[PDB]
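Interim report to the steering committee. The following record documents the input for Polo-like kinase 1 (288 residues).
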Amino acid sequence: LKEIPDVLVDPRTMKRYMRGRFLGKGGFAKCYEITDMDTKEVFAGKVVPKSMLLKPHQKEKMSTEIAIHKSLDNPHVVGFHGFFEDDDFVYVVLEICRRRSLLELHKRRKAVTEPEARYFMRQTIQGVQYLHNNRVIHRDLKLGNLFLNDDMDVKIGDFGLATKIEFDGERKKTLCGTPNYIAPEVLCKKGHSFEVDIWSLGCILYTLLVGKPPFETSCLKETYIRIKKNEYSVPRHINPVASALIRRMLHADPTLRPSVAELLTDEFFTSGYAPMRLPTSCLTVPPR
C-alpha cells in the first residue's frame, strides 16, 4: 500500500515528528507514539489514510470532529495540538495517553471498588461539564473513550460523533453513527440534546460498580428493545445511594435526568470515601 513516513512533517508549523511505537487502531485510523524531533516532546499521532476519506461525505465528518476537538482545552479532555496532511495521510497530533482506556481496566478488573467509581466518575463528569458549558455534546461516551495517562487521570477523547449546538433550545435529530450506550430518545428519533451524555454516564457508572453493562446482550436487536422499554436492574448489593443516582441518570424521561452541575454535588460523591489520586496498580488489582 503506502508506508507511513518515518518523519512526519507539515507545510504550516514546519515541525518534524518522528513516528514511534504502535499504540493501537480505531476504525480506519492507526495510532503511533510520535516525538517532536526539535523539542523532544511526546505526542500521540493519529494517522488516517486518504483512501478511507474518498467520499466528500466522509471528509466532512472528520472536518467537524477536528474543528470541535481543536477548540477544546481542558485537563479532562484529550489535548489537541494541531493537524495536517500529505498526499496520502491526514495526521492528527493528540495528547499522549499511555495507560489505554477505562475499558481495558474494566475487562481486567470487573466490578471496581466504590471509591474508585467516585474517582473515575468525578473526573469524567468534570470533563463532560466543560463540554456542555462550551455547548458540545459528546453523544458517544463509553469506557473505551475515557483514556488514562501515567497519572491515572481520565481524559475524554474521540469526538467522531460529537455535535455543537448553535442556538438556545436546539434538539438534534441526526446522529450519523452507532454509539455504544445510546439514550432511548435517539433510538426513537424523537430528538436529543445534552442529556444523552448523562444517560451514557449512567451506563458507565453502572458498568464500573456492577462489573457488566446495564443492557449487555449477545443480540444487538435485543439490546435496543431493553433500552426502549427501559429494562435494567441494579442488584441489591449496590449502595442504595449509588443505585438511586444510576436510576435518575438512566431515567426514560430526558428532562428528569440530572444536569452535569447536579452530578458533582450528589450524595454519592459527598457521603463516602473519594480519593484524589489512584495508583497505576488499579489497572489490574483493587487498591489496598
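The chain has nine helices and eleven strands. The committee is asked to note this result when reviewing the revised timeline.
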